A paper describes a structure:
Branched chain TAms (BCATs) catalyse reversible transamination of branched chain amino acids. A dimer formation is required for the BCAT catalytic activity, since residues from both subunits in the dimer contribute to the active site.
The crystal contacts in AF0933 appear to be contributing to the lower disorder of the loop in the D subunit. The residues Gln107 and Asn108 were modeled with alternative conformations of the main chain in most subunits of the AF0933_holo structure and in the subunits E and F of the AF0933_GABC structure. However, the AF0933 enzyme had a native molecular mass of approximately 220 kDa as determined by size exclusion chromatography, indicating that it forms a homo-hexamer with only small amounts of a homo-dimeric enzyme observed. The AF0933 TAm subunit forms up to 27 ion pairs, with five 3-amino acid salt bridge clusters formed.
Numbering used by the authors:
A (entry chain B), F (entry chain C): 1 to 119, 124 to 290
B (entry chain A), C (entry chain F), D (entry chain E): 1 to 119, 123 to 290
E (entry chain D): 1 to 290
Write the structure that this text describes.
Amino acid sequence: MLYVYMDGEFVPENEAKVSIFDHGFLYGDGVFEGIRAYNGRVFRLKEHIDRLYDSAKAIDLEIPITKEEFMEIILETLRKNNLRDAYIRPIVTRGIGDLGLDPRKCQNPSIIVITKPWGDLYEKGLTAITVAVRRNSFDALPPNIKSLNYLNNILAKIEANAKGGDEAIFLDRNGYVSEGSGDNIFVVKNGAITTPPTINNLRGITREAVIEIINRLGIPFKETNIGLYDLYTADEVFVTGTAAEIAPIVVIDGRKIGDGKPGEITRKLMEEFSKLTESEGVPIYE
Amino acid sequence: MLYVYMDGEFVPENEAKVSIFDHGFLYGDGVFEGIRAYNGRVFRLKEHIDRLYDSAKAIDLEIPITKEEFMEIILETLRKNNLRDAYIRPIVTRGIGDLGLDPRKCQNPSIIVITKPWGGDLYEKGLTAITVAVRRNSFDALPPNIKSLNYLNNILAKIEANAKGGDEAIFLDRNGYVSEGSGDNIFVVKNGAITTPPTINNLRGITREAVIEIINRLGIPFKETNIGLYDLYTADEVFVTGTAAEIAPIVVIDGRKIGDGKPGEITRKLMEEFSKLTESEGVPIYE
Amino acid sequence: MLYVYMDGEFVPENEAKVSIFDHGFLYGDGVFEGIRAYNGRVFRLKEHIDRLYDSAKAIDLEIPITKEEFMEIILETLRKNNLRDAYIRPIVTRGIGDLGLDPRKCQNPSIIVITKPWGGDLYEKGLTAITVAVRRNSFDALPPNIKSLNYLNNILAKIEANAKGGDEAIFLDRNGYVSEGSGDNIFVVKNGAITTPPTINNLRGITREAVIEIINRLGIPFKETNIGLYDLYTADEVFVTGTAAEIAPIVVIDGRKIGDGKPGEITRKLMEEFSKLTESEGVPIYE
Amino acid sequence: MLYVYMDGEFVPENEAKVSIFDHGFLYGDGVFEGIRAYNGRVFRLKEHIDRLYDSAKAIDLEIPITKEEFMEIILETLRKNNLRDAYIRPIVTRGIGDLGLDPRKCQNPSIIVITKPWGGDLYEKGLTAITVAVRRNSFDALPPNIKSLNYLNNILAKIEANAKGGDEAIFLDRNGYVSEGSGDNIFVVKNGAITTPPTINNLRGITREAVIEIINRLGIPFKETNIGLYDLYTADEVFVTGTAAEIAPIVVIDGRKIGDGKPGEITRKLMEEFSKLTESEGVPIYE
Amino acid sequence: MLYVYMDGEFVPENEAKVSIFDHGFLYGDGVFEGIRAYNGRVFRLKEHIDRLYDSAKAIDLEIPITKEEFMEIILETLRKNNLRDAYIRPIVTRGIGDLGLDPRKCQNPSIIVITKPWGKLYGDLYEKGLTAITVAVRRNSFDALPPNIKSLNYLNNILAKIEANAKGGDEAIFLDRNGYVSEGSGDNIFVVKNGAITTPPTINNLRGITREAVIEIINRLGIPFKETNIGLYDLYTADEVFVTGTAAEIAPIVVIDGRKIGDGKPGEITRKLMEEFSKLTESEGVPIYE
Amino acid sequence: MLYVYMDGEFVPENEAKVSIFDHGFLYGDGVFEGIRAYNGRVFRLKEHIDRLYDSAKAIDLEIPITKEEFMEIILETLRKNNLRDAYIRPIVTRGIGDLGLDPRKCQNPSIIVITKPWGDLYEKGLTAITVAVRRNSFDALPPNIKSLNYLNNILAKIEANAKGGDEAIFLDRNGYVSEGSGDNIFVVKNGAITTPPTINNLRGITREAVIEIINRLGIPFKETNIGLYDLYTADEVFVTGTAAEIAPIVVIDGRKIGDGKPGEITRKLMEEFSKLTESEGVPIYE
Ligand SMILES: [Cl-]
Ligand SMILES: [Cl-]
Ligand SMILES: [Cl-]
């Protein structure tokens, strides 16, 4: 029933498989994106594709097709599955080499496009915990690369699962707030909004869209380092990402954030963001 | 011609494939080992299997079979391919789940065993190494003690080495101490004494452990302690250790000749002793 | 019904009060100890008093009496309350001064001795622990070796543990190494060997020292070395040590079962040996 | 003569005492503020009270009264002592609980308000400062943004300054950036522009905020950014800000004259503007 | 043929020598500047002299003459050698003292001015662009040996240069003690991405006079500009990268750690800034002769 | 009339000058040693020469003569000046090159040997202060290299001069005790001695000799990281170096160390070290 684009063919999900000798599998040597289709439009497709190519560049991986070709493949995959509302996961792998680490011995990067249909926690808000693991360092495994190396994020998620949080919050190698395991973080205090610079986290496309809205609404905004203290004493906290959209965080490390309910500024941004997703995007069908 | 063990079946290499929905593929959420078979014996099989289970425990992954069963699967795979001299790569993945990162939605970890025939031009001359700008994954972020499918830190270091004229990359850690090579542990020889970093910022190498046993047996003064760039540059000899590499001499670091620029006497002695050990020890595949 | 020593007078608990202008209250500017009396003997009294004076020296606080006098005051306080089995908390404060933080304006340090009767369930099952996001106070900022009235770092860790389903919090330090629990030192048991962090990033525990003496006496291989999250997660056994806790097994860390998830054999052996030590050693309270 | 508010009653200073079993005393588990009354007005009372509640929130302490009630208690205490010019120190403690550090066993937080009369030589000449070896408490360990009873880090810095010939201590943070003085925020003036550290590694000073408002009103170029030792040493002018200090010029740092070694023109201008602000703003105590 | 100013006298290059007991030699205890003369004008002379005095202040060294006197000595040295296009290296040392490191035993700081003829034999020498590598050594810390001080302690820079020589780069790029991009071994670094320019704050590197001039041009041209921390990722994924310094002017970086930067050629924004900077150096400066 | 060896000639001190174009002067690009002659013997000459060559190797500088030749030049210089009790400062520079920092343009390293005669604070002990500047990092400008880059040490000394200490004590980039501005540090507590590992400081020749004495006397000894706390609460503290020998530290940051007088263990080591210097060394004359 659902087809996956895999190296020039459409393949049913149950048969969508990659060689175990692909370095993307052996070493997580590959890059991916997360993209949303709303009402027959692909939201910020070009921005996501730009980031995919940036991720590839960072790991010295040449994507064997052009950005225009990649965009067409994504639209084609959504068409083949007749989707209007979907989550899209393009993946590019290093390809097959030998059992060592050398990426120069790898031939034929795989191009994969997964599309899955998209059909309670946002009325109540999420509980978050700060994890003991620091975010992968920007001088070790830069988190700005959306790569198949996501075990740092998974360890944080495992901590959150064990420790009663819906979401994990990372600090970075220098003690600053970084992001959630799968999303950027914003703090609201006295009508002003702050978010960490992007060096220690990922340059979120949702984060960028939300900042555009914040500026359009004239809410005072600063991109600056934040600490545990700012999280705990915030009027409101929310996280942003493709899958999450804008998710309110109402408890952090057992402490109620403000009144413990999604805040007024968060709710306003949720509305404005919904509007943006309904009116922007590359059309799938004509 | 070569078969891979994949979840209870032997599958030809060309067909050995994993679902793209396995979290091992999507997120590198899985663990692996590198094991060597020499002359029909599997060198330190039990030690590698112990480490595999430790790696799995560190990432909260339950391996669905026992260690004894895992050892039997490895031996069976070597038998099916009629190998006596091989490299073995067991892999355990988190398994198929949804497209989020939550490992709770994953069911059925995959168990994979790759065996490839493994039959020293760079070892007579020694290797050139470069120190990389990327630090090793932190022991408080993505602990390098876990041999996981997250190897992009190692690959970035290797990319730097390829671009910068080194056969091998050397990492420093988040605190500025020498960690290891991109795929092996590092030892420094100075005035007849040997030092190696503690294992917290690198990986508890099985070769490293075997080499330390030899060092102690030979009565060479040995210390496990932090090392710096200075110690690398001014060493009498440097070598790296791992399953694939065995003992590889490093004769140039960052453009500087190490000692006389040839593999050193202590390194050569350890290479001989290690060869001897691989020829006389191990779990028999056939016998 | 209990008397507290307070600056030369014995005072009922309900009246044991300190001026709000004491810098020990305003700024946590003071030091303390935790000492145990077992069966009419005070366990390691001299070691605790030495550490109290070391803590005071570290914060440039002169304790206005001698160590011998301090020991006599402690024994007297236990006598006055007729205790044989107790927890003792000596406290020395900077003393009353002005509203600024300058300790030079403080005159007369207060000397306080609290003694409370000691009359487990969590020790048969073992404790659950979580690693906290807050790092331990740095050894170059507010050295954790000082047992001072500044315990908010420990309290924040405890608050995290309370919210996150742990009985105990485990700290990492400013450099990413394992430090200690919020109120106790940490030991890791792996393949019959024991490791514990060096004391620089934590506190030189008197229980920790006693336990190391036992470990050496029993010939269990022991190393004082840096430990990481990986070592915690993959340990055969983990336990914590302190005056109040004695030896407490840790059986779950961050949702991961430690070994079999029950107090381990080595831990149980050390618990027995430590019990024996407390029953046979100490400064007698009554003659 | 002077009364202290303590849990619903006015108590003479000499009798203002807290139980030694209060966690605010045992562990510095509590929060405080420093507020100034000028000419019958309380300067920035609401801002200080907001920060007090933020400090409490950061340490998960529930202040048992509302902010309005707290403001009334402060004004009442100033009235009872007939003060027009005073320093006010509200304190909230975790309260009496057990001898362990667990804050869940604490039940009734104490509310304390100290008011002391206020009544220049060092401000005409300026202060000498030294940079200390101790780093500021980390924003990921014991966040300095919390104005808590844990002030030993500040006291250690002050002890260093006392011993090393400075009127004031300057901290760097865990990452090597300038943080603040032991009891005040720091500003640097260079080529007519002013810089101050972001507030993450120090405290969000109410004086600092007021001074930034003045700076902006006067159109002096201003940047909140990280500063280093170099910026201190080569500054045209340096000054510190806090409730007690107001604006204090720093004219020597680590033996080096700052600019001409006298309070600078920009500093003097800000001192005048700040004086004006304190004379015309505030919550009236009486009228 | 070339004279060096040395403590009040002009001395031929071959005889320009300092006592081995000068702490400037023994311990690198001294400060220096790098200044350019273009077409009879000294570019940003006053800015360089201000930085020289700031460097001296940072190491608690009192320069025994005034800034005006120092400027006159520099112009005099250029005059004596009849230069119009030159590189100028003023140096101030702590002076002769005993063999311990205590600077209190030093008396009489030396003042040295070197001037060497400089200038392009070929206009487009940066037509292809430079290759760079990121080094393993971190930049001297701003809490250890602050890189803002242009001192005679340049071994950190030399180690990075040694790494670059061995590793196939024309230039070395440093990260700092906290993992952020700092600068090249002898120049400030700028990154261009989607028409916007970023550069590290100056705390972990040096407040470059070229960097300041380039920022003025960037602002005048209305290119979006931000001073903020940058990482390896930003270098690798940049549209363009360039470095700035007195000797280098504006040098395009077209390869970093084996990765082509954008199209692997000097970029449009870089080329535009190179032109604008050339114009600035042709029309500004303290006249040597006039 | 003291002579300095300079590239093959003995030159009077007042004329001992180096070209300002030598990179050793321009960039501190060179290495040095500090060696002591006692009663006609050069103490640990071979150890110092080994370290000099190690320093040179660390900065990729080829010393143009052999170690045996270097030792002869040192002895010759002491002979020419008729010294029996002296401080020797051999220096090797990168040499003259262009005005850039590239060491490849530098072709002829200078060899310099300074010898100066050596002829109250030890009875009373020294005051020390801990400095704000951290020691040059072992991953930036490794302090194990005894190079002409000594401004880190000088900044610490400037702090000590201004702050009332005879000596400055450094912490390292990771917060551990490193060393004094010109000497290694040892801490004595409950009859046991500790000293930092050598990675963050310099492998002192005096430090090595003192450790040999400590072992010979059977004093418990451990090489391990030390903190501010260990300094402040020590029974005794002392520093070691060629010029200082063994110097007691009796006050640190305003705190009396033990009783505020040189300790028993320190005094014992001072005696044992004196004995060692009187009975060991390469003879200058026959
Ligand atoms: Cl990392
Ligand atoms: Cl801290
Ligand atoms: Cl450094």
